[PDB]
Amino acid sequence: SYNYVVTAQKPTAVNGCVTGHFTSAEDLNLLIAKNTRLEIYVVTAEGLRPVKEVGMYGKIAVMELFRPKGESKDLLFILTAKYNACILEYKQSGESIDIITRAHGNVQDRIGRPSETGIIGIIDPECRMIGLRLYDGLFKVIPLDRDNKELKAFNIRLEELHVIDVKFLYGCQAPTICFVYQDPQGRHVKTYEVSLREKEFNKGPWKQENVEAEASMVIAVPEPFGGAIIIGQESITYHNGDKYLAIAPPIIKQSTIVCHNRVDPNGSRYLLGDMEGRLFMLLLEKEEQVTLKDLRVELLGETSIAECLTYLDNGVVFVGSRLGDSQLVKLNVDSNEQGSYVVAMETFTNLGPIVDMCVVDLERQGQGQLVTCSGAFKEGSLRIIRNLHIRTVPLYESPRKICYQEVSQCFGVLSSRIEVQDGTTALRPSASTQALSSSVSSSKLFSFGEEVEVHNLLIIDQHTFEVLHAHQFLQNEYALSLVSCKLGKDPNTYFIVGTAMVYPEEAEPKQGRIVVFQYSDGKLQTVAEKEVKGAVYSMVEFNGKLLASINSTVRLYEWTTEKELRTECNHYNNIMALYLKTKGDFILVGDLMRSVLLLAYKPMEGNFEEIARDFNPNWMSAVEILDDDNFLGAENAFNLFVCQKATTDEERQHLQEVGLFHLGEFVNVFCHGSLVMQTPTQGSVLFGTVNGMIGLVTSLSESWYNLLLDMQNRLNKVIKSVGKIEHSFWRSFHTERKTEPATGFIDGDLIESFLDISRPKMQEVVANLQYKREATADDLIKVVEELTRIH
Amino acid sequence: IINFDTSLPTSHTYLGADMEEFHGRTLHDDDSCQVIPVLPQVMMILIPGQTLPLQLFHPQEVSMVRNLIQKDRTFAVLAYSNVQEREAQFGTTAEIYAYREEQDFGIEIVKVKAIGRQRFKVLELRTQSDGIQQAKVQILPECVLPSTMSAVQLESLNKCQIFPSKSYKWWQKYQKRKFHCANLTSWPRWLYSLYDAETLMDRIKKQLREWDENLKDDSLPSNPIDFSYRVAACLPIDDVLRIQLLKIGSAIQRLRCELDIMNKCTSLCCKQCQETEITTKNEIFSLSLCGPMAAYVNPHGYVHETLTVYKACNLNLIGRPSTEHSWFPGYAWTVAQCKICASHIGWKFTATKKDMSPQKFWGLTRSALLPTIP
Amino acid sequence: IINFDTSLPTSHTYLGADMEEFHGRTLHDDDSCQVIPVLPQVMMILIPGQTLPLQLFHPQEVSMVRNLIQKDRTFAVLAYSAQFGTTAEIYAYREEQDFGIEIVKVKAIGRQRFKVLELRTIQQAKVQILPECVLPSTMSAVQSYKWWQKYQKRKFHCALYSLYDAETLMDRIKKQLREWDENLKDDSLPSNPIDFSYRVAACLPIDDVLRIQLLKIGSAIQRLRCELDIMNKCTSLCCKQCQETEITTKNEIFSLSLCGPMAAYVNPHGYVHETLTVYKACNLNLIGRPSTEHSWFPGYAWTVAQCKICASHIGWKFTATKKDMSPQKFWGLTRSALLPT
Ligand SMILES: O=C1CC[C@H](N2Cc3ccc(N4CCC5(CCN(C(=O)c6ccccc6)CC5)C4)cc3C2=O)C(=O)N1
Ligand SMILES: O=C1CC[C@H](N2Cc3ccc(N4CCC5(CCN(C(=O)c6ccccc6)CC5)C4)cc3C2=O)C(=O)N1
Ligand SMILES: [Zn+2]
Ligand SMILES: [Zn+2]
């Protein structure tokens, strides 16, 4: 297989943001790490002015600004998920802007398992070292000397394996870390002093303490207060030597606090963000003998569910979201309307998480549009994307699956909302509680404060995107699959929904339904309802019949003239058929553990028989049939793989992995289609990911594959990567178990970058290359422009 | 109610006391190719962590073992698909950890106790002059997978991925907080719970507790790999399924398959005549800390995988009770065989002393049983 | 060449030493009816003068024998063709508690032949003691080869009668017996036709279907005639389950005990086996390990032997446990597994 991957839409989810003085000593700068992109803005009264955008050969996991002594402006430390560490500077000479690499290295350890709490990265306030927590029981120190250009690091063993959070303390004479850890006795706060000369830990400035059973956040309070603040599920405590304070406000018990930010340089005010979108202000009270007098928490308002916060200036706060649009809000002294002090100023689009999507020619102009189910919880919405213009349709609940029915001119959307047992009460008005017409399921078949998922099928108009109808499902029913097809010889078009009956006392569902609805004359009508003995994980129309997965079984159904589903054949697989794809008479079955199974339907024998199989233990998030021989999948550690289908039975019955690639994204959905008006590229598969990035995979001929592979290998020698990460290292299929180089895949972003280099660089890349004629710059420009045409 | 010392069966006291015992361990690189001597007469599918007692008496076997004790104490046990026409694709290495030499009743016999260590695939089999085969085998790696949420886990709520150690409410909270980020994907939380090592281990313990009424949690290993191998060693399943379980590299897949076997198994029938039901899965019970089923060696070097049950049916008792070489000290055995086909099924153990609990049970040899799966 | 002690198997020392020997013979009248306790677990055709070792564990039989030692120590072993049978007199006795249960091991000796009149349920058999039909010399009714020529001439000078004379028939049977008892002693075999014929019948590997016929013969002359006829007719032995696998031939039979080629021994679990000792056997696989535990021929180690075409236990292979012993190896084949041809 010879494939080609490009990015139609870059990642939109914000995974980190910091504020500092990066571009200039005066400019107030906001740095945003999304997934692999780094956006540097200059904060102004008018808002944000995008100054630069950079691409990293890695997923940014740590991103901090620090100013060592002797530097006029701040440097930027970035660690990636593959442990590429780098120290960068913003160099500008007139209109020219580029990011210099002051230092770089790889801080991976040959052995050691990643800590479950994840990568932690902190910088001492005096910039004497960088402390990284990547593996259990180890603490990596990178000295911050002026000549450590290779970022040489040394480990210090930690007696406490389960470290929750850790910070560097302010005001300490020597580098001191305060961290929260958990042992069987409970959760404790400890402090150490770091000795670089001795390369070890010394007893910390103040003693060990005991904190809330679920204390999980540490804040380092700058001078004059000093000390640390521990934030847990019920209480907020402050420690500084012998000094100790504690509060247990009731306004925070409803939701965990997961992000914070300091408003004042003295630490008098902090921002706090909860999981449900509440923004609080934490206040520290000053007394002069300077010591902290008292803590108090005041709810500020409601924002989009925050992944991170950063106070810019003049009461403007940037809220970085992964589940919704990022926000620029204003903090007002006077409460307004209900009493919220937060006034949203600006919004920034975020398509992630893209959990499902479809391709539809809404205008019939022969150009495809993409309809995606984006966001989660109150951030859920539909996004319509076309050649890149984006339209938004908020739902205020979680969309899960989407289908299109051209005959009735509507979309069917599986959705879920969260209700509190109180009868169950909805927390807000959402799409499923505000439809023009609605119905509730009724079938003979089959505490206080708890949360329950209420599922609905929403019929939504394709023109105005109004919720025409909302059908609520049975209590404790989980709608999993959704198709829109014509079955048998019936002329009617139906929505078909597969469900499961989920009970917390039951690990694996034992009951489920397949419900056939018909949408007509403004009402949704239940046309049929078939009970099954498992969860209907997936469903596909199959030559006018219905193929479905029920636990570990693949069942075939026919639409009898009396409008009922009648079993045709069963195939009892050992694996759970989560993923179910069809092409012609071939069926691809996959489960969550990377097992792939290719079967074929025999029209004459009327049964299923296995064609091929490939069982390799690894997490798999999606699958697709590229063609009759090659199958594309998304595999753990943000990878793409391509399996392929001898004269010997033992060999013809085995798929071989002919392609591997490291994408850097978690792919949720594949779908055949394209957004360009309808060649070296044959085929097209769009895919949508957790971070909101939309990508495209096409197939290439071996000649073109080799030409573009040589162009790649020649571009890597001219293109100056940021952080000096190597492209082959970046794109190597990576798993916690092993690492292989990329095979069978052409990085189309690197290829398309060929049009950004200068003419001398084009000549250098193209030198001694054979197009039989020696290739020149113009020919390769033609190649790359034709390749860019595909999207 | 039970009052038997469940640690007694695992000590294999019937093999004699004062057995020289070796400490230490020999482990091989996960992918290295090695050459290992094969013990011929072992028609058993050994599993890592399982204890194999042997009474070897052939001069070739005795000499090979005597050489082994002076070297790495590891030999090979091949998982034959066919008992006859030896044809093994997979196997496991057993490391001798107890050893005694004797000359009882006219010949020299070596009794050893070994324990399964590492699985492997059969790359080559070579006969040797002494008659002890040498197998060229590559060690098989035990793959470990991270949490399914590690890929999509949000950085902001990473710090919430630690739970206070500790029942329905606790597991509901564990599912709610561990798989919160399942909302970023296309599957629900209860789907990912079906692939969680901890939840699967707990669900398996909920049936190990049904078998062993007074099961102590501390006994079972606290990591999924050892737990899965231990559970696999004690399931009354035919050779096909045992080999299938043996070649599963993942601990999660092995746990899932073991759970499916436990849930689906209904009754155990005589293998020779498949139509007669000997017992049911609800009669099984654990008399030793190894589990319901364990391997024991009889006075003539034959290894039987005996499953203990409270009640059995369609069995004739033949011969006399005897406490000689009893595998369960304090009990007397009696040969039992199918009353439809007169094929040996196992023994009936009856307590010698009054007030012993249980007073009677049955030990059924695995090779003569067939589990029926719906 | 045989140097093994042929009186060792007869003592049945595998049953243990220090057995309470019961000395004193009891006999019933030649016609008188009797009631005798039948042992229900012995599926063997006992013969007068034949020794039967037993190992009883079941409580009912243990109690039966325990009370029977005090009274006449006679029980009944039925033929189980149960029409005919024999009376066995216990002459050695012991009780123990080996491996959990109380066990009584005994050695009895068949005494008299009886017809089964009735059985009442430990069964009690009402039976009739069949007499011994001993006949006077026919030639007197109406009135190394030189000695017998003088015999057949001078004794029958009053004359076919040689074919029916007790002395000449016994001599012919002895001639045909020397092939087996390589160490034959003229004093080893009994001096009368009755005991001689009973021993010969005891040591033949014939099938039960003919052992019953020999048992029901009441005349020693007829019993000798039948024994000679069968001895001449039989040639080879085959696996019973196959009926088409020869294991050994009559020329390989030899006598390792003074009782003859074949004798009955109990195994550690009370099962009685009539083992025939032969020099060579064919079509047999050896299973398991050699053991000297509970060996029926002291100084030898046994290994299980079974037919290699159906895996039916045929017997054991006894191998010497010390050089300088002869024979070094032989086979003990169980009667139930063998079929004559
Ligand atoms: O708790 C327990 C359960 C019982 C278990 N036990 C005791 C035992 C004792 C002995 C044999 N034998 C297996 C091999 C053996 C078979 C019989 N033999 C013939 O000669 C022969 C064969 C066929 C017909 C007639 C006689 C001697 C050799 C003896 C096997 C076992 C065994 O499994 C145990 O040890 N403890
Ligand atoms: O010179 C000689 C010749 C040999 C002869 N010997 C020794 C002997 C020892 C033991 C048994 N056994 C016969 C009954 C017995 C059978 C095996 N057992 C199971 O549990 C079992 C059954 C089936 C499958 C697996 C195990 C124990 C009970 C033990 C029979 C014999 C016997 O004939 C003898 O005494 N001396
Ligand atoms: Zn049977
Ligand atoms: Zn046979």
Numbering used by the authors:
A (entry chain A): 2 to 290, 295 to 392, 710 to 744, 748 to 771, 781 to 979, 983 to 1015, 1022 to 1114, 1121 to 1140
B (entry chain C): 46 to 211, 220 to 427
C (entry chain B): 46 to 126, 133 to 172, 177 to 198, 220 to 235, 244 to 425
Show the paper's wording.
Cereblon (CRBN) is an E3 ubiquitin ligase widely harnessed for targeted protein degradation (TPD). Cereblon (CRBN) is considered a prototypical substrate receptor that operates in the CRL4CRBN complex through an interaction with the adaptor DNA-damage binding protein 1 (DDB1). We report the discovery of a molecular glue degrader (MGD), MRT-31619, that drives homo-dimerization of CRBN and promotes its fast, potent, and selective degradation by the ubiquitin proteasome system. Mechanistically, MRT-31619 mimics a G-loop degron and elicits CRBN-MRT-31619 dimerization with one CRBN molecule serving as a neosubstrate; this leads to CRBN ubiquitination and degradation by the UPS.
Using purified recombinant CRBN-DDB1∆BPB (DDB1 lacking the beta-propeller domain beta) in the presence of MRT-31619, we obtained two maps at 2.9 Å and 3.1 Å resolution, respectively. The two reconstructions represent the major conformations resulting from the CRBN kink motion and were both used for model building. While both maps reveal a dimer of CRBN-DDB1∆BPB dimeric complexes, one DDB1∆BPB molecule is poorly resolved due to local flexibility and was omitted from the final models. Given its higher resolution (2.9 Å), we describe in detail conformation 1. The sole interface between the interacting dimers is the CRBN neosurface comprising the MRT-31619-bound CULT domain and the N-terminal LON domain. MRT-31619 is bound in the tri-Trp pocket with the glutarimide moiety interacting with cis CRBN H378 and W380 through three canonical hydrogen bonds, consistent with binding interactions reported by other CRBN-binding ligands. Surprisingly, the two molecules of MRT-31619 adopt a complementary helix-like conformation that bridges the two CRBN tri-Trp pockets. The helix-like MRT-31619 dimer is stabilized by hydrophobic interactions between its spirocyclic linker regions. The formation of the complex results in the burial of 1528 Å2 of the solvent accessible surface area of both protomers, an area larger than most transient protein-protein interactions (800-1200 Å2) and within the range for obligate homodimers. In the cryo-EM structure, the MRT-31619 phenyl carbonyl moiety forms a hydrogen bond with the trans CRBN W400 side chain indole nitrogen. Superposition of the CRBN-CRBN structure with CRBN-CK1α-lenalidomide shows that MRT-31619 closely resembles the surface of the CK1α G-loop degron and its essential hydrogen bond to W400.
